[PDB]
Symmetry: C2
Subunit: 89 residues, 2 copies
């Protein structure tokens, strides 16, 4: 089935033929790196894969009927590259 | 390449090995997504494949019928920990 964090680490250890601990260090690093880049408002390309950035948002309007005004916000965003789009289709 | 720098630094290996190792991460994730399954990362977020069935629609120009093809879109859902850092 699916692949959680612990599953991914163990698949990286197996496939890169490094150890359980090294694999943990690398995946933890990928996670923390992207988080630290986006928190800084910056962009990060993980090539073969895609791009992570911060996407500025302004107010949509937007189930009682109501068009409440939702506030402007920064959210995270991922832009899949060509390789990822071709693997998955 | 700041990312590859953090890996070489935190794992204590060559930039070239950090390359290779990061490629492996990209591939598992890509392979799971390619199989229709999800990749779920505690305290970061989830990747998944947004599947949409063939539909028959309507040409916006002519009111004439229009097949709309099936699709498969790679998606990422950020979790709370990532959303909050970003705001």
């Amino acid at each position: 089935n699916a692949m959680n964090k612990t599953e991914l680490i163990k698949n990286v250890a197996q496939n890169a033929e490094i150890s359980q601990k090294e694999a943990t260090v690398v995946v933890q690093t990928v996670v923390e790196s992207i988080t630290n880049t986006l928190a800084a408002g910056e962009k990060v390309q993980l090539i073969g894969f895609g791009t992570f950035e911060v996407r500025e948002r302004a107010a949509r309007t937007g189930q009682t009927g109501e068009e409440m005004q939702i506030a402007a916000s920064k959210v995270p965003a991922f832009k899949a590259g060509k390789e990822l789009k071709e693997a998955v289709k």
